[model samples]
Target: VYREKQKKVESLPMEEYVTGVVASEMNASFEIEALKAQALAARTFVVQRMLSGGKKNNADVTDTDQVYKSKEELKKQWGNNYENNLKKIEEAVSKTAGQVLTYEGKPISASFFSTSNGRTENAADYWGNDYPYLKSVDSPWDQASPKFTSEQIFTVADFQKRLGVKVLADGKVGDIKGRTEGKRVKDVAFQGKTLTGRDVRDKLELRSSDFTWKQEGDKIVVTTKGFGHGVGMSQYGANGMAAEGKKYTDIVAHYYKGVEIKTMNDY
Candidate 1:
């Protein structure tokens, strides 16, 4: 309901997000074009992934036989709430497409413009032609890292408080905060290093692989590695998963957890 239902295109504000957490860690200046490229690439990636029928490579279990799906499945799964979603993706693609400048001496429309954090990807990333170029690197819906999973150990109320989730006496989902809101959770510091956790408790701060979350006072803390919303694909984790012979769908499912993959018309 934000943005007054109008499509607004912008880069994922890295500085505004981590703030003092990782801004200084960045060695280079943030280029608006680079950020635009990242956003456009991400928009294209997500739209294509959901649309169906790309190329098939190693990560694809169905690589041998490619099948495409429609957006219907999405509407059914998410409820008839995707009209706006479709518009958002399209607008993103359109806006970002306009921003890309081609090296061939011409401005390439977003269509057919490829992406890479630095290079290209194939089944080596998440199933060959079956997946798009970026999914292998800077996947929009995927995690940037794979070896890590954000473990939440906090109760609903406390977690909501840390995230600034607005409460309602009676509301949809009972006033629950979603993932973006969950990201606001302050990270825990250890030995001068900050660990990204969705919880606000200082004592509960811990790592996912190395330690488990513990309850403290009104809040619970757990250790986590990586960043972002931790959904869709994880570039660092995809590299690890592919190296292990896991199928592309398997990798997507791993991070998405229980969600099903369907085509645009599946709904």
Candidate 2:
């Protein structure tokens, strides 16, 4: 374990990395099928990084390595739920042991996030990296997530100040110039300025880039759909899929199109 001030660089096996990342990345109390899907994605991510030699420096668990939490750290945080949580997470890893998501015979990037705007984004649309497997697919299950829709209110003056754009007293933030393949706002334009959806989202610190805005009594009320970057697997969607008795394979395949599972041993 690379924890508890053990050493300068306490290395962990690839499998151990999967365990820690699973616990850190997804809720341990989630459905086992969700955890199983997460385990595969985590394992694949680490394996890809290792093969590509991405993590060069010694991984400091506190500040690094894809946000990891050790078994001991999890025990400390989980407290009463530690016993059952650990069993469930460990079972997820053990059941999917050494397995990774492969696309065209290679480990995919395995990107995932919290939720989606009724669909997952094509990697090309989000990150400009076109991966064959990272395609836009409907993920309606995410609608059930608590983060499905969030609203933020900004005073006309504050909104103008934050985005550094002049808005009339009417609080018309902008008009949707276009939408991406995943239906996220791609462009918004007004009076004399044009900003991308991400521009408004990031500058406003809104929940997601897929947003709709309107004026509510001199305040700009921006409503965002879903959460995260809307790329790859939607964690909440996966949970819903699992809740509906979908297997890990079905969950993974639905979110990540044209993918297959294979053991890391082959690589």
Candidate 3:
């Protein structure tokens, strides 16, 4: 069972739900193996959500939980190529069927993101919780993403107000204090006060925490690298691996340190 954004209740078999997620989460134009990898990961995440009682009001999921597109919505999205695109997604999902990635014989967190800043992140650094399988790993392929670098600028006063830091006499942001294993800023000092890098990111709506700062006259410039939270399987990274002839299984193993893919029926 699932709920739409408007609180409408609906129900479908587990396979159907997984199919919808695969279509919604990944591009059907991607390589077949990449699509397969996405199917498995999406399945793992949904199953874990179910086991944890993450749903409310008897709803297994919703757009807020995980963006889902019904058959109608998917058809509209695909438009001219609806039939072909739907078939490709269905093949990927059915081939992987009920498979799920597991760590220590249980479903792992299975978080994923759009792209990374040349390296994936440790779950501990991003979420303040450690998952052995979610440790940082090299993902240099993501550098090819168009969103690898981004820039945002804010006036000194705007930056201060957004960050809640008083401006110093020199109108400069103070030295950054620390960083995580993924090179995301940990803490930064401003006007003799301390604020976490995450605080600034949230305040300014920066792309990623891996950013550098500079004062250019009245504007404080921030240049960020990567998009989304730098954690878990990067969608672009998976596509890059697929382009290199890596199988879907290899892609999963590469992103997730040590996990086993098993069909749900096995349990």
Candidate 4:
């Protein structure tokens, strides 16, 4: 049983829930092994949430918690390809049925994202909390992702207005105060105002905090590498590994440092 936003209770089978999550989280056309890996991770996340007494809203599921797509919603998105898309998602979920990633006999925090720069970051560096299974690892193959590099440019006036700071006398945007080992900006100063890299990323809608800025005449250009939070499993990286003939278990083991994929029934 779960509660919806409006405080309405809802009941959904576990497999049904996992299917919806798998459909929503990844492209249906992705390799089956990648999809299977996602299925296991998604199941672990939800199962952990359930064991923790559900959401504060009393609902077991929420859009903000994890993007979920119902059959009807998938139909709308797939249109002419609904059957094929749904079939792929179903197979992914069924093949990995009742599987979950565990660390020390406990469900691990299964986080993932769209793509990465060439590597993933440790959980401690990004989230201020350390999880053994969520440590950093090289994901060089992610360079093949289309979103590996991107540019966001703003005219000087617009940039100043958005940042609420004036350009330096020398027409400099700001000084980067510090950065993580992964090169993600940690703190920056603009006209005496200090803001974290995440602050700038959110205000400017930049792709990731791992970015570099430069002044170009009347423009402030930012070059960003990778997409998402640059943590956990990289979806594009997973696909790249799959392309190299890696199995789903291998892919999972690679991303999550020290975790085991276990059948739920074993617990």
Best by TM-score: 2
- Which candidate's lDDT is highest? 2
Error of 4 at 211 (Å): 1.1
lDDT of 2 by residue, 1-267 (tens): 543432111276656666778899998778999999999988887767666655643211111234567667788888889989888888899899889998899887677889898988776634555777878899988888899999999998898888887775445667788888898999988778888887888889988889989988878988999887777899999999999999999999998889999988788
Model 1 Cα lDDT, one tens digit per residue, 105-175: 32111222111122112222233343222222333322343334466566647645554543232322121
Candidate 1 accuracy as TM-score: 0.24
CA lDDT, every model vs. true structure: 0.33, 0.81, 0.78, 0.79
Q: Estimate the TM-score for candidate 4.
A: 0.85
Q: Write the per-residue lDDT of candidate 3 for residues 1-267, one digit (tens) a residue.
A: 765443111366677777788889887778888888888888887776666565632111111255677778877888889899888888888899889998889876666777788888777534455777877888888888888899999998898888888655554465778778878888888656887777777889998888888788888888998877776788888888999999999999998899899877665
Q: Cα lDDT for residue 79, model 2?
A: 86
Cα lDDT tens digits for candidate 4, 145-263: 78999999999898888878887766557888887755678898877788888788888988888888889888989999888776678898888888889988999999889889888
Ranking by lDDT: 2, 4, 3, 1
Error of 4 at 257 (Å): 0.8
Error of 4 at 237 (Å): 0.6
